[PDB]
DNA sequence: TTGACTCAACATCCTTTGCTACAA
DNA sequence: TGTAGGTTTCCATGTTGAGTCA
C-alpha cells in the first residue's frame, strides 16, 4: 500500500512491484530506469494507494510572454500532443516546428530542456526564444555552460551530463528527433525522467531500423502533416525529375573489371550478399582476411566510379546552360566530386573540411545574392537554416535514406516560383534511388 | 601520447587482454614508412602511395605508422602567399561554362596578382600540405613508440592500475602525489592501486594523460609488474585484466622534467611554518600501516598530545573520498583532507575534509586545528 | 575569446531498370 | 527469434561537439 518513489543518478526506485522494475540489493528497493516514472506513477495513481512523488525537482520556471501567431495545423499539432503530453510531431523542414514547440512550452509553463544536435540549432533556438518568447535561455554546451530557466543543450552534453540533470526539466524537446535512437543518445533519453516529452522532426523514418523505440523513449507520432503534400501554405509544388547519364565507355571497362572481383569472390566462397541485409559479416571477414577487404574496397571504389562519374558533368553543363536566373544548389556524394565541380565550374564548396568562418561567409554571400550557384557535399541536410533556392541538383544519391532526400529536398522553402529538383544518376550502375 | 581506438590492435584469451605489439620482423615495413616521407612531399601523395602496402601488410599498423610520423613532421602551408583569397576573388566571376572563358578568367587572375594559381587553388587543407624537413628518426625508435602508444591506449580504458614496486618506493609515491593521481597504498605484496580514468564522470582526459606520464616514468626501472584491470566495450562493457612486466621494448625519451612542481605543497609548507610556532610539521612522516593497508599522509601536525595527519588531494570524486575516509577511520589520527574544486563540490564529513580553489588558506587550517584544540 | 589539432559517436554500407497508363 | 555457450564491433569516408595545449 504505502510506497515511496525516489530518484538517483538516472534511476527510479520504489517499494511496491510495478511492471517494468527489478529487485536490487545495493538499493534495497525495486529499481528501474527513470523514464518509467511517467508510467509507473500512472500505475500507482490508478491503484489508489496514495503514493507520494519526490522526483520532480523543477527549477523555478520564469514567467514568459507569448507572441506566437500560430497557424491552424500548428494548433492541431498542439492539441494532438496535449492529449497525453508524450509524442512526436512530423513536419517538413521549415514548417515552423520551432514555433510549435515554443507555443507548447508556453502553454505548459513548466521548466524545459531542449536537446539539439548541432551548435547551429543551439543558436537558432536561442534567437527564436529571444524573439518569440523574450527570454535568454540557459546555454549549456558549446561555448557556455549556463543553466537557467528554460535551457537548451547538445545531445552530447546531455549525455555526458545526464545524471547531473535527470531530476530536472519536467518537459523535454527533441528537434530533429531522428538523431535520438542512436547508441548513446538512447541511453541519454532513458536516464531522464521527464513525464512530458515532445520530439520534433521532418523525416522520422530511419533506414537503420531502430526507429521502433520511439514510444519507449518519447512516445508515438501523434500528428504528422502529410509529407510533401500540403503545398499551399508550405513550399511550392515539388517537381522532382531524374536525368539518366550514359556512363563513359572508357570508365565502363574498369567498372566491370572491378565488380568482377567482388562477384567472383562472393561466388567462390558462398556467403551471398545478394538480398542479404547483413553486410557486416563481410566486413568481419574483411578485418582479418586480405582478399576479403581487397574485394570489398574494390566494390567500394566501383560504387565511387558509379556515383562520381565524369560523364554526368556533361549534363551539368547542359543544365547550367538552361538555368541562368535561378538559385542553384548542387549536391554531391563525396568531397572528391565536390571539389572537382568547384575547379571545373568556379563554384564555392562547403564541406566539413572548409572552416567555420568561410562556411558562414559563403552562406552570407549566398543569401545576399552575390553567389548565385553553390556546391556542397551533403553537409546541408541538417537544420542549419541555410538560405533556400529554386533549382536543387542532386549528383550523389547517398543511398535511399529518407534523410538525404526528404530532409535534403526540403531546403527549398520559397513560393511563387518553379522550385524543381533534379537527380542526375547514371543508368548503368546502382542508382539506388529512394522508394 | 596515444593513438585512436580504431587502431588499437589486441586480442582476448580467456578474459585476459593481450596487446599485439610489433616484433623485429616488421622493421622492414617501418623502413619504407620513413622512406616514403620525403621533404617537400604532400600528404595526398603519401596516402595514395601507401594503399598498396595496406593490401599487403596490416592496415591498422600502416595507419599507426603514418599517423605518428605525420605527428612528428614539420608542415608548410603552401608556396602561394594568398592560400584562401584565391577562391575569394575567383569564384565571384559566376559559373564558367566554356573552356576559353575559363582560361581567360585564370589569365586575368594570374595578372591581378601573379602566380601559378592553376595548381595552388585549394591549399590550406590536409592533403595539400608539404614537408619543410624530413624528421630524423630510426625504425627501432618508431616501433618502440608505437608499442608504448598502444599500451597507453589500452590503459586509457582501465578501472584500476595496480603497480608492483621493485626497488624504488618513495620516488613513485612522490610522483603520484604531485601528479594528482588517486591511489590506495596496500602492503599485501606492497603495491599501489591507482584509480583508472573510468572512475571520472567527465574529467577523464587530463587524468589519463597524467597517469600516462607516471607510466612512462615507471617504464624506466628495474622491473615493473603492472596488473591493469581494463573496462572494454562500446555497446556493453566487460572487465578484463592486462598483466605485463619487464617489457624492455619501449621508448626511453623525454620525461617532461617539469610537469608539476608541487607549488601547492611548498606554498602550504612555507605558509604553515611561518604563521604559527605552536603546531609542528613533518616533511613526509613514515606511512602509517594498518592491517596491510598503507596510509601515506603528506604532513604530520602535532602539538603535545594532539597529532593529526593532513593530506592534500588532487583529482577526486565522491566515491574516492568516501572510501579513503572509511579506510582511514582506523588510523588513530584525526585525518585532515584538502580538496581541489575539480568535481561536484561536497561537504559531507566536514570534521575531516576542507576545500580550496587555487591555493591553501592557512586561516582555514588553523580554524580547523582550533576546532579540535 | 581565439585557433589549432585531435577523437568518440553516428552514418552509410544491400538485392537491378523492360508490356499500365496519370504528371501530384 | 529463445530452452545455451565464452568477446574487444568497425573493410571505408563523412560531421561535428567537446576537450585537450601552447
Ligand atoms: Cl490571445
Ligand atoms: Cl531579453
Ligand atoms: Cl510520417
Ligand atoms: Cl494518412
Ligand atoms: Cl577495434
Ligand atoms: Cl602473454
Ligand atoms: Cl600474425
Ligand atoms: Cl589559348
Ligand atoms: Cl606554543
Ligand atoms: Mg507584436
Ligand atoms: Mg507575419
Ligand atoms: Mg515525394
Ligand atoms: Mg557514352
Ligand atoms: Mg552479408
Ligand atoms: Mg569568427
Ligand atoms: Mg623477444
Ligand atoms: Mg640490422
Ligand atoms: Mg582565344
Ligand atoms: Mg640496427
Ligand atoms: Mg571518519
Ligand atoms: Mg580551478
Ligand atoms: Mg563525443
Ligand atoms: Mg555505427
Ligand atoms: Mg572548461
Author numbering:
A (entry chain A): 0 to 434
B (entry chain B): 0 to 372
The authors write:
XPB is a superfamily 2 (SF2) DNA helicase conserved from archaea to human. As the largest subunit of the transcription factor TFIIH complex, XPB is required for promoter melting in transcription and unwinding damaged DNA in nucleotide excision repair. In archaea, due to the lack of the TFIIH-like complex, XPB is in complex with Bax1, an XPG-like nuclease, to function as a helicase-nuclease machine for DNA unwinding and incision. Here, we report crystal structures of XPB from Sulfurisphaera tokodaii (St) bound to the nuclease Bax1 and their complex with a bubble DNA having one arm unwound in the crystal.
Extensive trials on crystallizing the full-length StXPB–Bax1 complex with DNA did not achieve diffracting quality crystals, so we engineered a truncated StBax1 by removing its C-terminal domain, which is absent in many archaeal Bax1 orthologues. The crystal structure of the StXPB–Bax1ΔC–DNA ternary complex was determined at 3.55 Å resolution. The DNA substrate used for the co-crystallization is a 24 base-pair (bp) DNA duplex containing a 6-nucleotide unpaired region (hereafter, bubble-6 DNA). Surprisingly, the 6-bp short arm of the bubble-6 DNA was unwound in the crystal, which is consistent with our previous observation that binding of XPB to DNA induces changes in DNA electrochemical properties even in the absence of ATP. The dsDNA region retains the B form while the two ssDNA tails are bent and split apart by XPB and Bax1ΔC, respectively. The DNA-bound StXPB-Bax1ΔC heterodimer spirally encircles the DNA substrate by the HD1/HD2/ThM of XPB and the NTD/CRD of Bax1, forming a tunnel for 10-bp DNA duplex binding with XPB closer to the fork. Furthermore, the ThM motif of XPB intrudes between the two ssDNA tails like a wedge with the 3′-overhang extending through the channel formed by the HD2/ThM of XPB and the 5′-overhang extending into the space between two N-terminal β-hairpins of Bax1ΔC. The interactions of XPB with the ds-ss DNA junction region are mainly mediated by residues from the RED and ThM motifs, two unique and important motifs among XPB homologues. When XPB translocates along the dsDNA ahead of the fork, the ThM motif grips the 3′ overhang tail and the tip of the ThM motif, particularly residue F278, functions as a wedge to break the base pairs along the way. In the ternary complex, Bax1ΔC interacts with the unpaired 5′-overhang nucleotides C13b, C15b, T16b and stabilizes the strand separation, likely enhancing the DNA unwinding by XPB. However, the nuclease domain of Bax1ΔC does not interact with DNA at all, suggesting that the nuclease activity is inhibited when the repair bubble is being created and extended by XPB helicase during DNA repair.
